[PDB]
Design a binder for this molecule. Structure first.
Ligand SMILES: Nc1ncnc2c(CN3C[C@H](CSc4cnccn4)[C@@H](O)C3)c[nH]c12
Ligand SMILES: Nc1ncnc2c(CN3C[C@H](CSc4cnccn4)[C@@H](O)C3)c[nH]c12
Lengths: 229, 229
């Protein structure tokens, strides 16, 4: 077995795992709670980071450095950009960018800063494992690019602009930051999102309606990956 | 003595300290280099994080968790909002917000997410120590609010809007994120910025001209604080 981090942003994205696991302990650290449970031969560490890039960066860092995570699976919801994605559909990120990281005034591409790249990649072995699990459970699973930033996108123009620049299939507020931390600390990273809305007009209303259910779809899937790991 | 972290974003903000310290060792970690030196009775850990909120969050996390920092001083440059600030002037942050953290579609104020606050405070003892050092060296030192986000601000409208919303005296891309990490990990934090530009039209040109010198002004000051610690 191994130490597996399971990370989400909101309580809704992680509580379904805690209710399935039943027996777990808690540690208060980094102004948050981290949850610990056995599952098969593995030792799980779970948390919801709170929303956004800074919060998620800190949690990923803590789970690896303090709690010894050897793999990190991210589970949660996202806003769909690709028109073929429907609410509830699962998307794993092959790579991710920060659409709101902007020193373009100095001639750099949007999302780029010196020492880093525009896209951060997820782990190929974990991605292939997800494809196997999807086949076994007869679940539709799409591969794609996720654009991350610290804004809830609910505007057709913004949606279109970010989709065009990064060829992004969905948006959210934690993926690129988590994948960056994992890459930096040499930990294999998997980023899974279930669609809660289509990031346009009324996206906030669709989010409210579908978040609880979409969060469970993603959460169930990452736990099924822990079985195969 | 104690373990003191000195953190900047860019090489220009930290290399002046390395040239003064002369004798230091290096460790490659978290896709970056961290520098280690004795100074008086203290053990220093230094680094430039690379630009932005995610990079700075990760470095602060690493310096505390992995390298045992008991205090963290941030040194660097910033864009002036307060009209009384001139290029080269020093500003320490009493508190900081993320101006680009936005779930306003759900009714929340700009900069607010659940579980967190709009402003993060710096450490009062370190701030008072800075005021003493400023008096001793006959250096003009202003206290103020810093607005942090992942954009280089070089636009009068954006400058004015961020200044108005947060009552911000300057802007930069790392302060709020660093101060948040330090608070979360119970480490006293000090954030010092020397002005490199006025965040308006041509801010990119003023930055290029004044970054090296303004960075030295800030860097000299934090090293003087390490003498009194
Ligand atoms: N269109 C979109 N744009 C940006 N992100 C998303 C997401 C995914 N999550 C939801 C949540 C912000 S909404 C939130 C709602 N209520 C309370 C707190 N946060 C953040 O963790 C990112 C789903 N759809 C998105
Ligand atoms: N007006 C302003 N807006 C936002 N931030 C600032 C800063 C402070 N720094 C400079 C740098 C972006 S410029 C940069 C240029 N070349 C390479 C990397 N970064 C980032 O670390 C924040 C000074 N003035 C600012």
């Amino acid at each position: 077995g191994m130490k597996i981090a399971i990370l989400g942003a909101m309580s809704e994205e992680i509580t379904p795992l805690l209710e399935t696991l039943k027996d777990y302990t808690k540690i208060e650290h980094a102004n948050n709670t981290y949850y610990f449970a056995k599952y098969k031969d593995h030792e799980l560490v779970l948390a919801y980071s709170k929303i956004g890039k800074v919060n998620s960066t800190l949690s990923a860092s803590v789970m690896i450095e303090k709690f010894g995570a050897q793999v990190l699976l991210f589970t949660g919801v996202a806003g769909a950009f690709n028109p073929e994605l429907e609410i509830g559909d699962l998307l794993y990120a092959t790579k991710l960018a920060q659409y709101d990281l902007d020193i373009t005034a100095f001639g750099h591409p949007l999302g780029f800063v010196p020492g880093n790249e525009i896209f951060i990649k997820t782990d190929e072995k974990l991605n292939n494992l997800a494809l196997e699990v999807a086949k076994e459970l007869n679940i539709k699973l799409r591969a794609g690019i996720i654009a991350t930033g610290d804004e809830f996108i609910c505007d057709e123009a913004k949606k279109a602009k970010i989709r065009e620049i990064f060829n992004a299939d969905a948006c959210e507020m934690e993926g690129a930051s988590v994948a960056l931390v994992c890459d930096a600390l040499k930990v294999p990273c998997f980023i899974l999102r279930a669609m809660s809305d289509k990031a346009g007009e009324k996206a906030e209303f669709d989010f409210d309606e579908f978040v609880i259910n979409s969060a469970k779809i993603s959460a169930n899937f990452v736990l099924k990956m822990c079985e195969k790991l």
